[PDB]
Structure formats: structure tokens, C-alpha cells
From Swiss-Prot, chains A, B:
Induction: By pentobarbital. Expression is negatively regulated by repressor bm3R1 at the transcriptional level. Changing residue 330 to P: Enhanced activity with small non-natural substrates with altered product profiles compared to wild-type. This is Bifunctional cytochrome P450/NADPH--P450 reductase. One of its GO terms (cellular component) is cytosol. In the N-terminal section; belongs to the cytochrome P450 family. Changing residue 401 to E: Ineffective covalent modification of the heme macrocycle. 2-fold apparent limiting rate of flavin to heme electron transfer for arachidonate-bound enzyme. Heme binds at residue 400. The record marks 268 as: Important for catalytic activity. GO terms for molecular function: aromatase activity; flavin adenine dinucleotide binding; FMN binding; heme binding; identical protein binding; iron ion binding; NADPH-hemoprotein reductase activity; oxidoreductase activity, acting on paired donors, with incorporation or reduction of molecular oxygen, reduced flavin or flavoprotein as one donor, and incorporation of one atom of oxygen. The chain holds residues 2 to 456 of 1049 of the full protein. This protein is a target of protein engineering. Its selectivity-directing and activity-enhancing mutations have been extensively studied and the designed mutations allow this enzyme to act on non-native substrates and/or in order to enhance production of synthetically desirable end-products. Changing residue 87 to V: Higher activity in the hydroxylation of highly branched fatty acids. Keywords: Cytoplasm, Electron transport, FAD, Flavoprotein, FMN, Heme, Iron, Metal-binding, Monooxygenase, Multifunctional enzyme, NADP, Oxidoreductase, Transport.
Length: 455, 455
């Protein structure tokens, strides 16, 4: 029963490419999935992929014996500054497994215990900023979540203080990074990228790349000249040895990994925290339950590692926010051999797939009628959730290496936010999702009322 | 008997006015005093004044039966936004004595004790900022001292948080205030203030005035809507009764007092702290003595009121810094009746005098030959200082109402800085004194090496 899959509207020789000519391409692709269903073909000059939206098909795509990670066009563009770091390397490149082996211990339990104190440092800075607001001033949520998450990966990972809460404007790094990611998103729809109309884009792209690399140099210079014995992500990067090849990372790859972890280690966690707070103020009953947990668990002025591990309802709040709005909204795969998807769609070796995560997470056959509802209780029993229904961290050996880092940081920070403040959606904010490859609310503001609980 | 005053060089019908056509007019008058001596006449079209530099003549000018406070042209210009607040009112205006009676209690010892905790709040924010700098970053001294001092008067005086340490740029109030003070100083030398060349200056001046008043609006509304009860400077402004008239201040005068205290309550203290640190890093023997005291007295993570009172040598450092560079560097007087100054200079009722405080403080007949040297030991025994020899806070009933506030804040903060850091003049900074009517080092930077003492 070989089916022919739908395809959205075409534009002559540009095929489907102009459908990406929007500032919200992921949301546009979601609307297409709404209309075409669980699978549709998407073509551009010289390229074809297939967008998957159903758990029925995505569970087969997650078979690592059949499909391996593919670099989407977006990741190929980001590779211009992230190189063969963990996020933008092919599984078969030597530096993928080597860096994976070397950096996996930087996310062990004992590693997370070692990061905890510095995570608290930044979280306390966030709480103090908010305690110090005047009456009827408000919080710019994504902006402050980005301050927090960038500073956390800088300090925990590299012993470097971006000091984001000492800045009313974003750190230079953030400004360049957002611009580079803007350029990568926008370059996706360009039919003729070498047209001189984009000479300035190219110049600015390089400019933003040197800005990011300059900071990387500074981080590296300080560490090697330092006199403080550190044991963090940068330590493993400079000293760890791959058990297989016996080799450490070389300097070029280390630079790529730092860029990778500074970007990947904060941007999606700030999106997650922003969406979580959004859903909490829109669902006060859920906020209360989570606040009750926070008050009962966080009985000391400074949260401990053990206490964060007990914020289990906060944990399902974050998972439910990742279900509705997974902040890294897609990943790509290619067929390792000829194979047939779902018994209907044959693929040849090398054929590409796009996993459209926000649409997967809206599969009504999995989650039921109330799929648009924010109900953290959905996550009470992982054994009741079918395989590969929930993929906000990717799949298999190419899944998110920093998943536990993000969840620990976000659980800690949200727990402290709910311990220390009541929140008001004073503008009745209308959710507006900005796309920079990743997803984040734009213009989300709230008011906090202090519970006046000492730190 | 009757002597003729010297006068500096003239410019035809502009008389002496072009001598003020400089970005550093106080320093120019200072050099003129060095050439001409204890008194010189200064003429501009339509105006004459006499600049006094010796303690011999200044002690007579400080006789309140013979001379009263005059509004210099500088203060007349600043009155365009400070009105009949305490700094820019005539002694004979009803609102001077009324506001003085109402607000003096805000600066009593019991009020000082009540401001202390908030002063520590901002000081701790300063220390934490510097603790969090990375390897070989540096401190912009006048910029951070202005962050501290504005936030201190805002919090202590008005329970309002400017949150200047959350801004990498100057607070908008500071930008507009600096520009208005700049305009007021530059306006002093304009022979034709109505030349169209100044139309933009006037436009900008009005705009900076509005920025300043908008912030005043926020402070008043913040207080009026505040269900929390306070007992600070703004409380007395809004509720205190003058025992003489029995009246409280009216709304118009309240606005002028708030602008007056926001400016006069921080600008000159930022200058003092900046000059003090400058002299400390240029005089390591003195820095050592001051740091010894700070380390010995401030034995607790949170300094107490009593401990700040014990920082005697830190206090002498501050007074010696006020001796060399009094940051409000002049005040003006007029003759109440015909009188003879110093047995030699006849004055008519209404004749004006300018007290050049930096020159007073260099009178070798008072201080000895070493007047240019930074020697806090001069202040060891305060009864050794002759009357009217040391006047950084003005004179008599028109003296600085905030003297004790400024010295307590500055002693606390300088004490904490010396407790928590070693300082390095890593650029061998060359003193450059920016003039905005008030005086402050420009471009002064240092490196701080934490002593790693917990807060
Ligand atoms: C909620 C926050 C986060 C989300 C939703 C997220 C999501 C993902 C996803 C979906 C992938 C797979 C990408 C693909 O298949 O092309 C991935 C990979 C990765 N993530 Fe995360 N991530 C998060 C936080 C972090 C953090 C904090 C770090 C760093 C500490 C991190 C480091 C990485 C790295 C290095 C990879 C590449 C892993 C490999 O292939 O070896 N992520 N992430
Ligand atoms: C080291 C810092 C300071 C210096 C050097 C200083 C200096 C002076 C001087 C010289 C005068 C007399 C001006 C004249 O005769 O025209 C004065 C007046 C005044 N100062 Fe200060 N001052 C300082 C700090 C402060 C602070 C912190 C406040 C507010 C808390 C303040 C509030 C005032 C007020 C209100 C007046 C006018 C007093 C009146 O005439 O009733 N000053 N100051
Ligand atoms: C950085 C973490 C998130 C990355 C998610 C990237 C996911 N894209 C972010 C923007 C849209 C979405 C996507 O569908 N992209 C495709 C677009 C494409 C398909 C076919 C031909 C040409 C180009 C791609 O990049 O190949
Ligand atoms: C705000 C607290 C500090 C005030 C310091 C003021 C002190 N001036 C600050 C800059 C110079 C100095 C001063 O000598 N000014 C005179 C100028 C003047 C004199 C005679 C004729 C025309 C103009 C004045 O303003 O009258
Ligand atoms: C979100 C992850 C990421 C990783 C590398 C470059 C750009 C983005
Ligand atoms: C330095 C004190 C002051 C006071 C009012 C206006 C401008 C300056």
C-alpha cells in the first residue's frame, strides 16, 4: 500500500522554498502540517525533505539502526561558526564520538552536584533583581531568562561571568549570536545566496562571528593563565582523554565546543523558562500547585542539590511546557539504507526527514482531546506514554547531552521564582513566538509581588 | 589704607568674560588666584564680582551679620529646574526657612541611624559588582561612584530604587542632569545667550529638565500609592510642619526639593569618593593606614552604624580629599550693608563675593608649606583647624544640610572598598578634573584585587 504524500504549494523553479520567506517559518510549517497531515514533501532547488508530524511515523524515524542524525540546512549554516562541535558534527566524523566520550562525564550526577552552587549564584542574582523593582515596574521575561541562562552556562561551564544582570542591554555575545541566528534563519529561503544583494549580510555575519570568537579567546586565555584549580566543562575540554582514540580534543575543536555550549547551553533553556512562566500565569491552578511544592521543599534560604531533585511537580511543569513549545523545534534525519516508513512511504538510502516536534507533541492519538491544555499531570507516569511521543531533546546517541543541566537549572530557578514571588499577567499577554531557529516568547511581561522571604 | 584690587586680563568690551570660555573654569580661576593673590576683581558686561582666596578675607565674608548667601550666575541657571528648593532659594524667601525647619530633622543622628541599613544595601551591591569582575577587567571609578551615590539618596531619601548597578549605561536621570549642569556651566561664558547658535542647547536643556521632572513624578506617585509606611526624607517633605509658620511644604516646592536632593544629595559625594580613591592609589603609605583601619574595625560582614563611626582615619582621608578638591568648589555672598573687607576693600550694599574654596584650602599661612601634599594626618586633631579655614560644606545657616549624610555614606563605602579589595593604578592615571559646576575626576580607572572576604 504505497501512498503518495501531499506537498504544499509550489512556486515554479523555487519549489516550496518561498514558504520559508517569513519570520515564523516553524509556525508556518505547523499550519501546513495541520492541513496536509502526518507527512508532507518539501522541496527546494537541489533538495528534498519530508516533514513528519505523527508519533506513528516518528517512532520509526527514531530507529537508530535505520536513521542517523542529518544536518538540516539550518545546522549547515550554523556550522559556519560552530564547526564540528557536538551539535553540528556528523555522527561519522571522528570528532563527534571523541568529544562525546570526553564531555559525557561533564553531565554526570557528580558533575551536576558540582555545578549547583554556581547555578544558585546566578539564580539569586535573578531573585534580587526582581526584589529590587519598584512598584508597578514589570519584568521583561525572555530578556531576564536569557540573562540568567547565559550567565549560568558561562559560570558553571567556564568560570566566566558575563555579568548579564549588570547590563540593561544584552551582552555583546547575545547581540551577535541572535544576529548570526537571524542570518541563518533568513538564509534558508534565499534562492541565490551569492547574489551581491547579500554582501552586507555576509560582512555582518563574519563580524558577528569574530565577536563570538573573541569572547571564546578570552575564556580560554583566562583559564590557562588562571591560578584557581577548576573542575568544570572547560577543564574536561582541555584535559579529558577519549577512552577509544586515547586523544584529547585539539585546540580548533575546543573552540567550536565552547561556542557550541555557550549557544546551546543557554538559548533553549531561556525559551523553556519563558514558556513555563507564561503557561503558569495563564493557569493559576497549576501555578499554585507548583508554588505549594516550592514552599514545602525549599525550606532553606539557599536551595540544595538534593532539594531541587525533590521538585518533581516543577519538573512536570517544565516537561509540559516543552511539550507545547519545544524550544529547539525540529531535528533532521537521513535513511541509513533503503527502508519503508509506516508501511506506506518507501525511502532510499540518504533520503532526509524533518521531525516537526511541536506538531508531534500535538498528536491527538497520543495525548487525547485536551491536547492544547497545559496539564503537567500528563507526565506523572512515563510508562503510560507511548515510545517516542515526546522528543524535545532529540533522539538516541545524538540526543541533547545537556538535558540534565537544563532541567536542573530550570527546576532550581522556577522553584525559587515560585518560592519568592506571586506573579500577575497584568497585560493579559497575547502569546507571540519569535523564531531564531529556536523558539521564545516575544514581549512577554509580568508583575511580581514579593512574598518577602529572605535569601 | 584703601587698596586697589588686581584684575586678570581683559578682552575689550567683553571685559573678563572670555576667561570662562573653557571646559575647566574653576581651575582657570584657581590659576588666576595663584597669580593675583587673595582677592581679584572679575568683570563681565553688566556684572562685577570679587574672588576671595585667603582665610583672612573669607572669615570676614563668613560673618553672617555682614554677608548673606548670594545666587551666583551658576545657581541662577540651575534654579531653572531647582526653583526655590533649599540650594537655590534666597535666605529671605519664605520657602527657605520653612523648608529648612521642616527638613533639618531628616538629618538628625536618629535619622542617620535609620538610613544606615539602606546605605549598606547599595554599598554591598557595589562590592558584589567588583567581586564579580573577570580577570584583568577594570573599574570606571566616577561612573560606579555615581551609581552608588544616586542609588543611596534615592533609597534612603525616597524609598525608590534607581537600580543603577543593573545598567551598563548611566541612568537616564544622570545623563540629563549631567547635560543640564554642562549647559549651565557653558551658559556662564556666553556673551550673547540669544544667538541662534544656542537654540538647540536651549531645546536640549528643556528636554533634560523634563526627564528630571518625569522621574520626580514617578517618585511622588510611588509614595502616594505605597501602602507600606515609611519615615524618610520624602515623608518629612509630604507631612512635616514648619513650627514657625505652622505650614507644610506645598506641592510645587516639594517637587523642587526632590530634584534638589536627588542632585545635591549624590553628585558631590560621587566626586568625593572618586577623588579619595585617586589620592589613595597615588599615596600608598596613606592607603596602607586607611586599609589597616578598615580591616580592623569592620569585623562583621555587614558594617554597623557604630563601626562606621570608628573609621576615624578613613574620615580624615575624606576630609583631606575635600581640602584639595572640594567638589562644590565655590559659594557666593552679597554685602548686606556697606562694609569694609579686610580693612582695605570698601564694599557697597549688594556687592557680590565669590569664595574660591580650593584656594582657601591651599592658604599656606593656615596649612603650612606642604599644601599640595595629600596628608590626612592634618585632620588628626580637629580643634587644631582655625575657624573658616576648611569650608567644603559652605557657611552658617546656609551650610550643607546633608554634610553628615555624605560623610557617613562616604566613610562606610570607602571603608568597605578598602576592606574587600587591594587597588592598582594600572594606567598610572593622570588626574583630569571634569567640571560640571561640580568637580570630578574624568577617566579614572583602577584594577581591584579581591581579598576574598565574604559578605
Ligand atoms: C530545554 C533546553 C534544551 C533543549 C530543548 C535542547 C534540545 C536539544 C535537541 C532537540 C538536540 C538535538 C538536535 C539535533 O538532533 O539536531 C540537542 C542537542 C544538543 N544539546 Fe541540547 N537542549 C537544551 C539545553 C541544552 C543545554 C543546556 C546544553 C549544554 C549544556 C545543550 C547541549 C546540547 C548539545 C551539545 C547537543 C548536541 C549533542 C550531540 O549530538 O552530541 N542543550 N539539544
Ligand atoms: C561631599 C559632598 C557634599 C559637598 C562637598 C557639599 C557642599 C555643599 C556646599 C558648599 C553648600 C553651600 C552652597 C552655597 O552656599 O551656595 C551645600 C548646600 C547644600 N547641600 Fe551639600 N554638599 C555635599 C553633600 C550633600 C548631600 C549628600 C546633600 C543631601 C543629602 C546635600 C544637600 C545640600 C543642600 C540641601 C544644600 C542647601 C542648604 C541650604 O542652603 O539650606 N549636600 N552643600
Ligand atoms: C538550532 C536548534 C534548532 C534547529 C531547527 C532547524 C529547523 N528549521 C528552523 C527554521 C525552519 C526549520 C526547518 O524546517 N528547517 C529546514 C528548512 C529547509 C527545508 C528544506 C529545504 C531547505 C530548507 C532546514 O533547515 O533544512
Ligand atoms: C552646584 C554647586 C557648585 C556651584 C559652583 C559655582 C562656581 N562656578 C562654577 C564655574 C565657575 C564658577 C564661578 O566662578 N561662577 C561664576 C561665574 C561668573 C562670575 C562673574 C561674572 C559672570 C560669571 C558665577 O556663576 O557667577
Ligand atoms: C541551539 C543550539 C545551537 C548550537 C550551535 C549553534 C547554534 C545553535
Ligand atoms: C550640588 C548641588 C546642586 C543642587 C541643586 C541643583 C544643582 C546642584
Amino acid at each position: 500500500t504505497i501512498k503518495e504524500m501531499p506537498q504544499p504549494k509550489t512556486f515554479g523553479e523555487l519549489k516550496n522554498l518561498p514558504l520559508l520567506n517569513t519570520d515564523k517559518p516553524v509556525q508556518a510549517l505547523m499550519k501546513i502540517a495541520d492541513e496536509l497531515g502526518e507527512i508532507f514533501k518539501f522541496e527546494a532547488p537541489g533538495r528534498v525533505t519530508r516533514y513528519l508530524s505523527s508519533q506513528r511515523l516518528i517512532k520509526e524515524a527514531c530507529d537508530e539502526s535505520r536513521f542517523d542524525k542529518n544536518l538540516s540546512q539550518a545546522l549547515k549554516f550554523v556550522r559556519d561558526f560552530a564547526g564540528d562541535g557536538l551539535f553540528t558534527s556528523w555522527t561519522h566524523e571522528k570528532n563527534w564520538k571523541k568529544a562525546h566520550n570526553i564531555l559525557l562525564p561533564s553531565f554526570s550526577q557528580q558533575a551536576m552536584k558540582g555545578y549547583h552552587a554556581m547555578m544558585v549564584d546566578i539564580a539569586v542574582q535573578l531573585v534580587q533583581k526582581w526584589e529590587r523593582l519598584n512598584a508597578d515596574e514589570h519584568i521583561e521575561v525572555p530578556e531576564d531568562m536569557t540573562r540568567l541562562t547565559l550567565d549560568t552556562i558561562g559560570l558553571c561551564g567556564f568560570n566566566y561571568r558575563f555579568n548579564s544582570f549588570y547590563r540593561d542591554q544584552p551582552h555583546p555575545f547575545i547581540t551577535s549570536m541572535v544576529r548570526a541566528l537571524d542570518e541563518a534563519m533568513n538564509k534558508l529561503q534565499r534562492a541565490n545566496p551569492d547574489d551581491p544583494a547579500y554582501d552586507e549580510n555576509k560582512r555582518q555575519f563574519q563580524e558577528d562571528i569574530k565577536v563570538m570568537n573573541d569572547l571564546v579567546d578570552k575564556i580560554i586565555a583566562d583559564r590557562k593563565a588562571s591560578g584557581e584549580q577548576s573542575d568544570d566543562l572547560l577543564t574536561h575540554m582541555l584535559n579529558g582523554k577519549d577512552p577509544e582514540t586515547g586523544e584529547p580534543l585539539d585546540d580548533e575543536n575546543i573552540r567550536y565546543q565552547i561556542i557550541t555550549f555557550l549557544i546551546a547551553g543557554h538559548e533553549t533553556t531561556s525559551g523553556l523558562l519563558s514558556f513555563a512562566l507564561y503557561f503558569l500565569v495563564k493557569n493559576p491552578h497549576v501555578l499554585q500547585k507548583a508554588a505549594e511544592e516550592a514552599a514545602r521543599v525549599l525550606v532553606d534560604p539557599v536551595p540544595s542539590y538534593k532539594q531541587v531533585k525533590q521538585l518533581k511537580y516543577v519538573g512536570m511543569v517544565l516537561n509540559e511546557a516543552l511539550r507545547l513549545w519545544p524550544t529547539a523545534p525540529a531535528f533532521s534525519l537521513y535513511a541509513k539504507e533503503d527502508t519503508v516508513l509506516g508501511g506506506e512511504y518507501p525511502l532510499e538510502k540518504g533520503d532526509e526527514l524533518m521531525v516537526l516536534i511541536p506538531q508531534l507533541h500535538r498528536d491527538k492519538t497520543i495525548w487525547g482531546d485536551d491536547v492544547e491544555e497545559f496539564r503537567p499531570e500528563r507526565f506523572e507516569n512515563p510508562s503510560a506514554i507511548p515510545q517516542h511521543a515526546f522528543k524535545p531533546h532529540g533522539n538516541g546517541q545524538r540526543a541533547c547531552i545537556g538535558q540534565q543541566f537544563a532541567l536542573h537549572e530550570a527546576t532550581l530557578v522556577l522553584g525559587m521564582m515560585l518560592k519568592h514571588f506571586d506573579f500577575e499577567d497584568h497585560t493579559n499577554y497575547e502569546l507571540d513566538i519569535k523564531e531564531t531557529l529556536t523558539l521564545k516568547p516575544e514581549g512577554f511581561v509580568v508583575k511580581a509581588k514579593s512574598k518577602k522571604i529572605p535569601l
